[PDB]
Amino acid sequence: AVPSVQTFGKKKSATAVAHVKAGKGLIKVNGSPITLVEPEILRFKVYEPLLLVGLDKFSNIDIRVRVTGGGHVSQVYAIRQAIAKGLVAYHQKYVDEQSKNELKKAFTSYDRTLLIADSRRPEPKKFGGKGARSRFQKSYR
Amino acid sequence: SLVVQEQGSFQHILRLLNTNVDGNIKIVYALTTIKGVGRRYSNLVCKKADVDLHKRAGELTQEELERIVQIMQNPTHYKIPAWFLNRQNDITDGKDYHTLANNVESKLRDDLERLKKIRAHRGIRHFWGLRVRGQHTKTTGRRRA
Amino acid sequence: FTPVVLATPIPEEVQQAQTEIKLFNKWSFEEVEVKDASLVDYVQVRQPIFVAHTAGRYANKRFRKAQCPIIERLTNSLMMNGRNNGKKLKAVRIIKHTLDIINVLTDQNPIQVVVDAITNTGPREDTTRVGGGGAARRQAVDVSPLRRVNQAIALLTIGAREAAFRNIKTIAETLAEELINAAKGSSTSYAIKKKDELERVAKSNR
Amino acid sequence: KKKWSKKSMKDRAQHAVILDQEKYDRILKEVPTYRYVSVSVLVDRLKIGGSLARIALRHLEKEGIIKPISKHSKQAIYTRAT
Amino acid sequence: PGVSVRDVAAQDFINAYASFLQRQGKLEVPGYVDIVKTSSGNEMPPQDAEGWFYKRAASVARHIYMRKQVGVGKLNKLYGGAKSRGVRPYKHIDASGSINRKVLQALEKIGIVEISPKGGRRISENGQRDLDRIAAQTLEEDE
Amino acid sequence: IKIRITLTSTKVKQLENVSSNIVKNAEQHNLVKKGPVRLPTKVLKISTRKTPNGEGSKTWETYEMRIHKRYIDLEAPVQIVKRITQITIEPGVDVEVVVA
Amino acid sequence: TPVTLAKVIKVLGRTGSRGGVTQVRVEFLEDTSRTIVRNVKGPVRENDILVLMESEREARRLR
Amino acid sequence: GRVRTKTVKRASKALIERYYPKLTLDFQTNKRLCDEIATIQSKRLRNKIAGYTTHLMKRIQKGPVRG
RNA sequence: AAUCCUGGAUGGAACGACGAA
RNA sequence: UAAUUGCGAUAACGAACGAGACCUUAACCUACUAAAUAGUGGUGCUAGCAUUUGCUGGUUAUCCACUUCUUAGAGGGACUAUCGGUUUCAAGCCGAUGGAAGUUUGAGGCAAUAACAGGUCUGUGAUGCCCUUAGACGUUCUGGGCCGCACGCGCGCUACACUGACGGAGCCAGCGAGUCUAACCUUGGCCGAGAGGUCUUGGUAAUCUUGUGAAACUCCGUCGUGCUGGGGAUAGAGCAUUGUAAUUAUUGCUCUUCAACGAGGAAUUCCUAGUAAGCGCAAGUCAUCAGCUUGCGUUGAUUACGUCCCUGCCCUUUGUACACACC
Ligand SMILES: [Mg+2]
Ligand SMILES: [Mg+2]
Ligand SMILES: [Mg+2]
Ligand SMILES: [Mg+2]
Ligand SMILES: [Mg+2]
Ligand SMILES: [Mg+2]
Ligand SMILES: [Mg+2]
Ligand SMILES: [Mg+2]
Ligand SMILES: [Mg+2]
Ligand SMILES: [Mg+2]
Ligand SMILES: [Mg+2]
Ligand SMILES: [Mg+2]
Ligand SMILES: [Mg+2]
Ligand SMILES: [Mg+2]
Ligand SMILES: [Mg+2]
Ligand SMILES: [Mg+2]
Ligand SMILES: [Mg+2]
Ligand SMILES: [Mg+2]
Ligand SMILES: [Mg+2]
Ligand SMILES: [Mg+2]
Ligand SMILES: [Mg+2]
Ligand SMILES: [Mg+2]
Ligand SMILES: [Mg+2]
């Protein structure tokens, strides 16, 4: 047994599990490195926590995330949340607390959602319309 | 990737099957100007004639053009699978032709005339000028002509 | 600076844009000081972002959109007129192309260019239907910073869209030339034309 | 059968779809002096069509006259090489 | 260090593998090629048309390398798409089945894919080695 | 001997009472077991116009039946199995046992 | 090309029949000690800033 | 709005009327003794009662309260 | 220790309906 | 105050109904219970690349361990908590910090008294009276019709194109349904351009269909401002399926035909955040037929956070020749 945790990131309906352990610094995504995420722009959106905290903190540790649910953008957001949360869990359990708390402060200074999942969920569809708030169309004459 | 400059061989609007086909646009969608020729038939014949589809119609040889129209008016000889044909199992001889520029509307006419002299429902409907495919006529096709 | 390498090879341009400085897509957010005050505190700069996409929730409270970065506001005001609703990725791509164009032309920072355009195309006076009843007319009034910014973005995007519709120029380059003409002060830009007619009407109805 | 409109027309331009030597050496001399180059530029300037324009951009970028900075489909961007 | 299909981008891999197969020029083509649409929902045939059997073959090889087992039903579900039924609203429609079926037959012939238990088709060691080496070429072209 | 017992009711607390009394019987007899696997409850939805006639505002009504399903796997002699099926039944609860 | 900057110090209330206008008493940044009441079209907070195209005008205060 | 109803207010007033030398200005302990000392069907109503008891104790610690 | 102050408005057009109960 | 919600005032006191409370649902729990019908890791066997440790995978009787993800059950959690302002300084309101969550947390279910001479005897073996009751208005068989078209309205679907159409690759959801004395959802194999056909298989269903590999979307390319590869109505010919039977084409497929439409006048509808809008998907009806509805999720904006100007609602005061009540 070597130091390892497992965390998760979430969005509307996506879930990104993330196994984090000690290794040589490979960051894979469902079979593949982080450079092949295929929006080609939220690739940079997912590089964010790495580029923020500095890649030196990823040399000792390997992350492997499995993602299911949602659509492409939501899978990306689940990925970045699971990554940041797994890093923070590692630095909480195995490394001291000061590194963890400055890491958390950096993440929450840049963007709050990196470590906590947004609360917005779909409102149900109500009859008389196609959506929740919309109604079909009134005709008086 | 490279630009052929050009020669004076280019021609604008040309003629085939009694139709003034426009040049300066690609061959397939140019030949689709011909009645009885659509995008599928045109792409297929331009493939079977060994023609570069990237080329504009206005730069082609009479060899290529006559080969193409030969394939058009005699398709089944050039391994066209007989279900591309607009008129198969025709109505009289059982053979599978392919109608073109004027034959399309003349054959449409004599079909309507067959149905009318038979006094069938579709023929009476056409003769009155109404819709035939069971569509509704209460609230659509008002300004029918 | 350090080039560090991982078990997964992280490229050097991403390493640099990580640890050198926090850029845009590939542009710095410093050297974009606003010269005209009264729009500071409402154009959110000095909070850099790698892309203009964020799942940010600013429409819950009143003045929270002022803390949303202007480029996300521009992307957001791009996706409209129906078919294009949603599709924020296309807006982001169009924006990236547009800022590349505004760098090759007019080699200043394209972010400085767009904020200059915002500052210049902000209607300062505007009208309203006022009265105590039948005595109804178009009385002129001041315009607030936030509505100035919003109306600026609306005018820019609408002009770009109306230009790009039914012609060959891309939405990207229409937006680019519109932004540049606006930042200069042109009277060819849709936004500036609308601005000056609005201001003239306001002047006339004092 | 009313319009509620009148729908005025346009000039119906006549962009070129084949080129020649005059248009070609014109391209070669006039693509320089352009700080930003793409299909819309090479259609509002030199009156080729977009197909010719894309082929010409690939051609020029091959030998190297116009420098790319991003070559996204539906929007190709090029400047002049110093 | 080790290389596989997953460490290389999809589009580039597939283009490389289809070029390899077109240059190899031995796989198969049925004969009804250059006639068909690949799907009831498409309204035109392909535009390349000097190939694209190689592209589909590369794509399904990638797909079976990723997955455990597949079938013509799955591939029709995947390569099918939005059919414009003119005036009525769009809809998902499965693709043409003979195409993918004969693709899998030709790949079984050349020995990239084998028939699997639990029904369907699976990647064998030969195709695995081949695809890995092609991806190796695809990312050592980077130098 | 490898029996499964499934409980496919609507009344959650009656069902849980049955599951509880079964498992305490199992442990007082010292029987190893896979615990109560609570399957996902399934919601039979039925959507209907409230009105018999057609007129009125188009008001709709979604009735639901919640079906809660549980099961437990046991390893035990058939004598204790048959008396187990002899005991532990409730109103409004459908049970079935299956060997192998 | 003269314009006057004015800082908002007090939001009084909404005005106009449809509520799309707000009365505010401001403080001229330049030439301070001067306070004037003005209409505004959009949203506004205290300590915001306004660009008066003309400074010599105040609205009929609703009192 | 966050107005509370007469059920809450009256129940809190009773709890303060006869359990003052007891619960203090902390909602958590006030909750954890109110569930013990009164029987209530709902956790939500319990928490509302406890919050109002805390507010009333805050009132009491600086001057008295009418009623 | 300095120190002068206020309360306040109007504002166009808009015809008609069988009786029975 | 969302609220006859409450502070309080007080010829009223004390109560009830309604609202609220409540119930369901969605969001938090690396705290409890567990789970080859959901997963994860490890170890066995094994494929490939690297070989130097490793990386990606496969593996049913290889077992071992765990429950973060997933399921549920029992519970916890938020009560506007804490702080600062403001108010007779009370109910309460604003802001900030914290927090999963601080618009009664969000959406719904139930939802008062009094009424409409609202709708429905075509849902009722719920029904009074009248009519009819054996060449019946009963019942049933055949064939038509309810689709019928010079026109006028309403709910909607397609689009009027480059933020685009098309061809390739990429490739991601959720709510749910399904066969018994039946014949359902169908995987996989083969044939066929296609629709579809055929040989088998799984499933009474967290297990199989189904990761429902959905669509819009992204990346590459073709086209190139041309009523044009936009648009795909209207027609002709043929091939398949449902069903006893499709002829006024049931539908599906193929080819050909290629009309208006160039952003819509007076008018007018819906909508304040994961909401509008785009996007498709399951179910309902169903032998076949979705352009409809009921729900589902994917992408996801702008603009208010206010007013009573229009249309109306509530409370009070006021006037009234109104009482089937300003029609
Ligand atoms: Mg919707
Ligand atoms: Mg659409
Ligand atoms: Mg354009
Ligand atoms: Mg596709
Ligand atoms: Mg009269
Ligand atoms: Mg009269
Ligand atoms: Mg294994
Ligand atoms: Mg307080
Ligand atoms: Mg509620
Ligand atoms: Mg009745
Ligand atoms: Mg009868
Ligand atoms: Mg009818
Ligand atoms: Mg309706
Ligand atoms: Mg596409
Ligand atoms: Mg699913
Ligand atoms: Mg079309
Ligand atoms: Mg259906
Ligand atoms: Mg029917
Ligand atoms: Mg219906
Ligand atoms: Mg209205
Ligand atoms: Mg009077
Ligand atoms: Mg009277
Ligand atoms: Mg009157």
CSV table of N, CA, C and O in Angstrom, one decimal, chain E residues 34-114:
chain,number,residue,atom,x,y,z
E,34,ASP,N,-18.6,4.0,-54.5
E,34,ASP,CA,-18.8,5.2,-55.4
E,34,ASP,C,-20.2,5.3,-55.9
E,34,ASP,O,-20.5,5.9,-56.9
E,35,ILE,N,-21.2,4.7,-55.2
E,35,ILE,CA,-22.6,4.7,-55.5
E,35,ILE,C,-23.5,5.2,-54.4
E,35,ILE,O,-24.6,5.7,-54.6
E,36,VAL,N,-23.0,5.0,-53.1
E,36,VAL,CA,-23.9,4.9,-52.0
E,36,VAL,C,-23.6,6.1,-51.0
E,36,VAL,O,-22.6,6.8,-51.2
E,37,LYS,N,-24.5,6.2,-50.0
E,37,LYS,CA,-24.5,7.4,-49.1
E,37,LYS,C,-24.0,7.1,-47.8
E,37,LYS,O,-23.7,8.0,-47.0
E,38,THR,N,-23.8,5.8,-47.4
E,38,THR,CA,-23.4,5.3,-46.1
E,38,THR,C,-24.5,5.4,-45.1
E,38,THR,O,-24.3,4.9,-43.9
E,39,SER,N,-25.7,5.9,-45.5
E,39,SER,CA,-26.7,6.1,-44.5
E,39,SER,C,-28.0,6.5,-45.2
E,39,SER,O,-27.9,7.3,-46.2
E,40,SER,N,-29.1,6.1,-44.7
E,40,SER,CA,-30.4,6.6,-45.3
E,40,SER,C,-30.6,8.0,-45.0
E,40,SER,O,-31.4,8.7,-45.7
E,41,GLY,N,-29.9,8.6,-44.0
E,41,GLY,CA,-30.1,10.0,-43.5
E,41,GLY,C,-29.3,10.9,-44.3
E,41,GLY,O,-29.7,12.1,-44.5
E,42,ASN,N,-28.1,10.5,-44.8
E,42,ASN,CA,-27.3,11.4,-45.7
E,42,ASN,C,-28.1,11.5,-47.0
E,42,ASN,O,-28.9,10.6,-47.4
E,43,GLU,N,-27.9,12.7,-47.6
E,43,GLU,CA,-28.6,12.9,-48.9
E,43,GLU,C,-27.6,12.9,-50.1
E,43,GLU,O,-28.1,13.1,-51.2
E,44,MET,N,-26.3,12.8,-49.8
E,44,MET,CA,-25.3,12.7,-50.9
E,44,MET,C,-24.3,11.6,-50.5
E,44,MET,O,-24.3,11.2,-49.4
E,45,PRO,N,-23.6,11.1,-51.5
E,45,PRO,CA,-22.5,10.3,-51.2
E,45,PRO,C,-21.3,11.1,-50.6
E,45,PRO,O,-21.3,12.3,-50.6
E,46,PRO,N,-20.2,10.4,-50.2
E,46,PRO,CA,-19.1,11.1,-49.7
E,46,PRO,C,-18.4,12.0,-50.8
E,46,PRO,O,-18.7,11.8,-52.0
E,47,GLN,N,-17.6,12.9,-50.3
E,47,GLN,CA,-17.0,13.9,-51.2
E,47,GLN,C,-15.6,13.4,-51.6
E,47,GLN,O,-15.1,13.8,-52.7
E,48,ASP,N,-14.8,12.8,-50.7
E,48,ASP,CA,-13.5,12.3,-51.0
E,48,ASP,C,-13.7,11.3,-52.2
E,48,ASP,O,-13.2,11.5,-53.3
E,49,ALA,N,-14.3,10.1,-51.9
E,49,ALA,CA,-14.7,9.2,-52.9
E,49,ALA,C,-13.6,8.4,-53.6
E,49,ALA,O,-13.8,7.4,-54.3
E,50,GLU,N,-12.3,8.8,-53.4
E,50,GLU,CA,-11.1,8.0,-53.7
E,50,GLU,C,-10.6,7.4,-52.4
E,50,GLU,O,-9.4,7.6,-52.1
E,51,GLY,N,-11.4,6.7,-51.7
E,51,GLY,CA,-11.1,6.2,-50.4
E,51,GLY,C,-12.3,6.0,-49.5
E,51,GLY,O,-13.2,5.2,-49.9
E,52,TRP,N,-12.2,6.5,-48.3
E,52,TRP,CA,-13.2,6.6,-47.3
E,52,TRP,C,-13.7,5.3,-46.7
E,52,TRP,O,-14.1,5.2,-45.6
E,53,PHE,N,-13.5,4.2,-47.5
E,53,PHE,CA,-13.6,2.8,-46.9
E,53,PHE,C,-12.4,2.6,-46.0
E,53,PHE,O,-12.6,2.0,-44.9
E,54,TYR,N,-11.3,3.2,-46.3
E,54,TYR,CA,-10.1,3.1,-45.4
E,54,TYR,C,-10.3,4.0,-44.2
E,54,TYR,O,-9.9,3.6,-43.1
E,55,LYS,N,-11.0,5.1,-44.3
E,55,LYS,CA,-11.3,6.0,-43.2
E,55,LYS,C,-12.2,5.2,-42.2
E,55,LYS,O,-12.0,5.2,-41.0
E,56,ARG,N,-13.3,4.7,-42.7
E,56,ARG,CA,-14.3,4.0,-41.9
E,56,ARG,C,-13.6,2.8,-41.2
E,56,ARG,O,-13.9,2.4,-40.1
E,57,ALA,N,-12.7,2.1,-42.0
E,57,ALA,CA,-12.0,0.9,-41.4
E,57,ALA,C,-11.1,1.3,-40.3
E,57,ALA,O,-11.1,0.7,-39.2
E,58,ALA,N,-10.4,2.4,-40.5
E,58,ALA,CA,-9.5,2.9,-39.4
E,58,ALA,C,-10.4,3.3,-38.2
E,58,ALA,O,-10.0,3.0,-37.0
E,59,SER,N,-11.5,4.0,-38.4
E,59,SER,CA,-12.3,4.4,-37.3
E,59,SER,C,-12.8,3.2,-36.5
E,59,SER,O,-12.8,3.2,-35.3
E,60,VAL,N,-13.3,2.2,-37.2
E,60,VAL,CA,-13.8,1.0,-36.5
E,60,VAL,C,-12.7,0.3,-35.8
E,60,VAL,O,-12.9,-0.3,-34.7
E,61,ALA,N,-11.5,0.3,-36.4
E,61,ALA,CA,-10.4,-0.4,-35.7
E,61,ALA,C,-10.1,0.4,-34.4
E,61,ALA,O,-9.9,-0.3,-33.3
E,62,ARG,N,-10.0,1.7,-34.4
E,62,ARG,CA,-9.8,2.5,-33.2
E,62,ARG,C,-11.0,2.2,-32.2
E,62,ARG,O,-10.7,2.0,-31.0
E,63,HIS,N,-12.2,2.1,-32.7
E,63,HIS,CA,-13.3,1.9,-31.8
E,63,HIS,C,-13.3,0.6,-31.1
E,63,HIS,O,-13.6,0.5,-29.9
E,64,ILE,N,-12.9,-0.5,-31.9
E,64,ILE,CA,-12.9,-1.8,-31.3
E,64,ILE,C,-11.6,-1.9,-30.4
E,64,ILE,O,-11.7,-2.7,-29.4
E,65,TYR,N,-10.6,-1.2,-30.7
E,65,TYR,CA,-9.4,-1.2,-29.7
E,65,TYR,C,-9.9,-0.5,-28.4
E,65,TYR,O,-9.4,-1.0,-27.4
E,66,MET,N,-10.7,0.5,-28.5
E,66,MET,CA,-11.2,1.2,-27.3
E,66,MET,C,-12.1,0.3,-26.5
E,66,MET,O,-12.0,0.1,-25.3
E,67,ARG,N,-13.1,-0.4,-27.2
E,67,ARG,CA,-14.1,-1.1,-26.6
E,67,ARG,C,-13.7,-2.6,-26.5
E,67,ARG,O,-12.6,-3.0,-26.8
E,68,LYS,N,-14.6,-3.4,-25.9
E,68,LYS,CA,-14.4,-4.9,-25.9
E,68,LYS,C,-15.0,-5.5,-27.1
E,68,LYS,O,-14.2,-6.2,-27.8
E,69,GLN,N,-16.2,-5.4,-27.4
E,69,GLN,CA,-16.9,-6.0,-28.5
E,69,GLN,C,-17.9,-5.0,-29.2
E,69,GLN,O,-18.4,-4.1,-28.5
E,70,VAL,N,-18.1,-5.2,-30.4
E,70,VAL,CA,-19.1,-4.3,-31.2
E,70,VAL,C,-19.8,-5.2,-32.2
E,70,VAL,O,-19.6,-6.4,-32.3
E,71,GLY,N,-20.7,-4.5,-32.9
E,71,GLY,CA,-21.4,-5.1,-34.0
E,71,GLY,C,-21.9,-4.1,-35.0
E,71,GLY,O,-21.8,-2.9,-34.7
E,72,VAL,N,-22.4,-4.6,-36.1
E,72,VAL,CA,-22.9,-3.7,-37.1
E,72,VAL,C,-24.0,-2.8,-36.6
E,72,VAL,O,-24.2,-1.6,-37.0
E,73,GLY,N,-24.8,-3.3,-35.7
E,73,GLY,CA,-25.8,-2.5,-35.0
E,73,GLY,C,-25.2,-1.3,-34.3
E,73,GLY,O,-25.7,-0.2,-34.5
E,74,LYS,N,-24.2,-1.5,-33.5
E,74,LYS,CA,-23.6,-0.5,-32.8
E,74,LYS,C,-22.9,0.5,-33.7
E,74,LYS,O,-23.0,1.7,-33.5
E,75,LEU,N,-22.3,0.0,-34.8
E,75,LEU,CA,-21.6,1.0,-35.7
E,75,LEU,C,-22.6,1.8,-36.5
E,75,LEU,O,-22.4,2.9,-36.8
E,76,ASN,N,-23.8,1.2,-36.8
E,76,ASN,CA,-24.8,1.9,-37.5
E,76,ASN,C,-25.4,3.0,-36.6
E,76,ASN,O,-25.7,4.1,-37.0
E,77,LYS,N,-25.6,2.7,-35.3
E,77,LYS,CA,-26.0,3.6,-34.3
E,77,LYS,C,-25.0,4.8,-34.2
E,77,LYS,O,-25.4,5.9,-34.0
E,78,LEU,N,-23.7,4.5,-34.4
E,78,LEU,CA,-22.7,5.5,-34.1
E,78,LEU,C,-22.5,6.4,-35.4
E,78,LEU,O,-22.4,7.6,-35.2
E,79,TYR,N,-22.5,5.8,-36.5
E,79,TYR,CA,-22.2,6.5,-37.8
E,79,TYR,C,-23.5,7.0,-38.4
E,79,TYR,O,-23.4,7.8,-39.3
E,80,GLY,N,-24.6,6.6,-37.9
E,80,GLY,CA,-25.9,7.2,-38.3
E,80,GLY,C,-26.0,8.6,-37.8
E,80,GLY,O,-25.1,9.1,-37.1
E,81,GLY,N,-27.0,9.3,-38.2
E,81,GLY,CA,-27.1,10.7,-37.8
E,81,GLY,C,-28.4,11.4,-38.0
E,81,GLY,O,-29.5,10.7,-38.2
E,82,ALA,N,-28.4,12.7,-38.1
E,82,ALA,CA,-29.6,13.5,-38.2
E,82,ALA,C,-30.1,13.5,-39.6
E,82,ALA,O,-29.4,14.1,-40.5
E,83,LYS,N,-31.2,12.9,-39.9
E,83,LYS,CA,-31.9,12.9,-41.2
E,83,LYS,C,-32.8,14.1,-41.3
E,83,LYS,O,-33.8,14.1,-40.5
E,84,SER,N,-32.6,15.0,-42.2
E,84,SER,CA,-33.5,16.0,-42.6
E,84,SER,C,-34.7,15.3,-43.3
E,84,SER,O,-34.5,15.0,-44.5
E,85,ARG,N,-35.8,15.1,-42.7
E,85,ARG,CA,-37.0,14.6,-43.4
E,85,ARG,C,-37.8,15.8,-43.9
E,85,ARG,O,-39.0,15.9,-43.8
E,86,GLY,N,-37.1,16.7,-44.7
E,86,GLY,CA,-37.7,17.9,-45.2
E,86,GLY,C,-38.3,18.7,-44.1
E,86,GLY,O,-37.7,19.4,-43.3
E,87,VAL,N,-39.6,18.7,-44.2
E,87,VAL,CA,-40.4,19.7,-43.4
E,87,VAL,C,-40.7,19.2,-42.0
E,87,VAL,O,-41.0,20.0,-41.1
E,88,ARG,N,-40.7,17.9,-41.8
E,88,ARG,CA,-40.9,17.3,-40.5
E,88,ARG,C,-39.6,17.4,-39.7
E,88,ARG,O,-38.5,17.6,-40.3
E,89,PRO,N,-39.6,17.3,-38.4
E,89,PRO,CA,-38.4,17.6,-37.6
E,89,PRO,C,-37.4,16.5,-37.8
E,89,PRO,O,-37.7,15.4,-38.0
E,90,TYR,N,-36.2,16.9,-37.6
E,90,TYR,CA,-35.0,16.0,-37.7
E,90,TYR,C,-35.1,14.9,-36.7
E,90,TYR,O,-35.9,14.9,-35.8
E,91,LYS,N,-34.4,13.8,-37.0
E,91,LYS,CA,-34.4,12.6,-36.3
E,91,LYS,C,-33.2,11.8,-36.5
E,91,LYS,O,-32.6,11.8,-37.5
E,92,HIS,N,-32.8,11.0,-35.4
E,92,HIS,CA,-31.7,10.1,-35.6
E,92,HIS,C,-32.1,9.0,-36.5
E,92,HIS,O,-33.2,8.4,-36.4
E,93,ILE,N,-31.2,8.6,-37.4
E,93,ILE,CA,-31.4,7.4,-38.3
E,93,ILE,C,-30.2,6.6,-38.3
E,93,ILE,O,-29.1,7.2,-38.4
E,94,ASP,N,-30.3,5.3,-38.2
E,94,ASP,CA,-29.2,4.4,-38.3
E,94,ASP,C,-28.5,4.5,-39.7
E,94,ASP,O,-29.2,4.9,-40.7
E,95,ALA,N,-27.3,4.1,-39.8
E,95,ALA,CA,-26.5,4.2,-41.0
E,95,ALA,C,-26.8,3.0,-41.9
E,95,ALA,O,-27.6,2.1,-41.6
E,96,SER,N,-26.0,2.9,-43.0
E,96,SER,CA,-26.1,1.7,-43.9
E,96,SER,C,-25.3,0.6,-43.3
E,96,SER,O,-24.2,0.8,-42.8
E,97,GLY,N,-25.9,-0.6,-43.3
E,97,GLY,CA,-25.3,-1.7,-42.6
E,97,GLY,C,-24.4,-2.6,-43.4
E,97,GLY,O,-23.5,-3.1,-42.9
E,98,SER,N,-24.7,-2.7,-44.7
E,98,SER,CA,-23.9,-3.4,-45.6
E,98,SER,C,-22.4,-2.9,-45.6
E,98,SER,O,-21.5,-3.7,-45.7
E,99,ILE,N,-22.3,-1.6,-45.5
E,99,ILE,CA,-21.0,-0.9,-45.5
E,99,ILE,C,-20.2,-1.5,-44.4
E,99,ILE,O,-19.1,-2.0,-44.6
E,100,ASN,N,-20.6,-1.3,-43.2
E,100,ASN,CA,-19.9,-1.6,-42.0
E,100,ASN,C,-19.7,-3.1,-41.9
E,100,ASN,O,-18.7,-3.6,-41.4
E,101,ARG,N,-20.7,-3.9,-42.3
E,101,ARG,CA,-20.6,-5.3,-42.3
E,101,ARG,C,-19.5,-5.8,-43.2
E,101,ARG,O,-18.6,-6.6,-42.8
E,102,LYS,N,-19.4,-5.3,-44.4
E,102,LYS,CA,-18.3,-5.7,-45.3
E,102,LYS,C,-16.9,-5.1,-44.9
E,102,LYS,O,-15.9,-5.7,-45.1
E,103,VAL,N,-17.0,-4.0,-44.2
E,103,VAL,CA,-15.7,-3.5,-43.5
E,103,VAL,C,-15.2,-4.5,-42.5
E,103,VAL,O,-14.0,-4.9,-42.6
E,104,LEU,N,-16.1,-5.0,-41.6
E,104,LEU,CA,-15.7,-6.0,-40.7
E,104,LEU,C,-15.2,-7.3,-41.3
E,104,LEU,O,-14.3,-7.9,-40.9
E,105,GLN,N,-15.9,-7.7,-42.4
E,105,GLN,CA,-15.5,-8.9,-43.1
E,105,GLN,C,-14.1,-8.7,-43.7
E,105,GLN,O,-13.3,-9.6,-43.6
E,106,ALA,N,-13.8,-7.6,-44.3
E,106,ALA,CA,-12.5,-7.4,-44.9
E,106,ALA,C,-11.4,-7.3,-43.8
E,106,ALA,O,-10.3,-7.7,-44.0
E,107,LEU,N,-11.8,-6.7,-42.6
E,107,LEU,CA,-10.8,-6.7,-41.6
E,107,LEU,C,-10.5,-8.0,-41.0
E,107,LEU,O,-9.4,-8.3,-40.6
E,108,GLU,N,-11.6,-8.9,-40.9
E,108,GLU,CA,-11.4,-10.3,-40.5
E,108,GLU,C,-10.5,-11.0,-41.5
E,108,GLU,O,-9.6,-11.8,-41.2
E,109,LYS,N,-10.7,-10.7,-42.8
E,109,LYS,CA,-9.9,-11.3,-43.9
E,109,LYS,C,-8.4,-10.9,-43.7
E,109,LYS,O,-7.6,-11.8,-43.7
E,110,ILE,N,-8.1,-9.6,-43.6
E,110,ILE,CA,-6.7,-9.2,-43.5
E,110,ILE,C,-6.1,-9.5,-42.1
E,110,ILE,O,-4.9,-9.4,-42.0
E,111,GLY,N,-7.0,-9.8,-41.1
E,111,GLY,CA,-6.4,-10.3,-39.9
E,111,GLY,C,-6.2,-9.2,-38.8
E,111,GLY,O,-5.4,-9.4,-37.9
E,112,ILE,N,-6.9,-8.1,-38.9
E,112,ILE,CA,-6.8,-7.1,-37.9
E,112,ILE,C,-7.8,-7.3,-36.7
E,112,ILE,O,-7.6,-7.1,-35.6
E,113,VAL,N,-9.0,-7.8,-37.1
E,113,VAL,CA,-10.1,-8.1,-36.2
E,113,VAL,C,-10.4,-9.6,-36.3
E,113,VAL,O,-10.2,-10.2,-37.3
E,114,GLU,N,-10.9,-10.1,-35.2
E,114,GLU,CA,-11.4,-11.5,-35.1
E,114,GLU,C,-12.9,-11.5,-34.6
E,114,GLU,O,-13.3,-10.5,-34.0
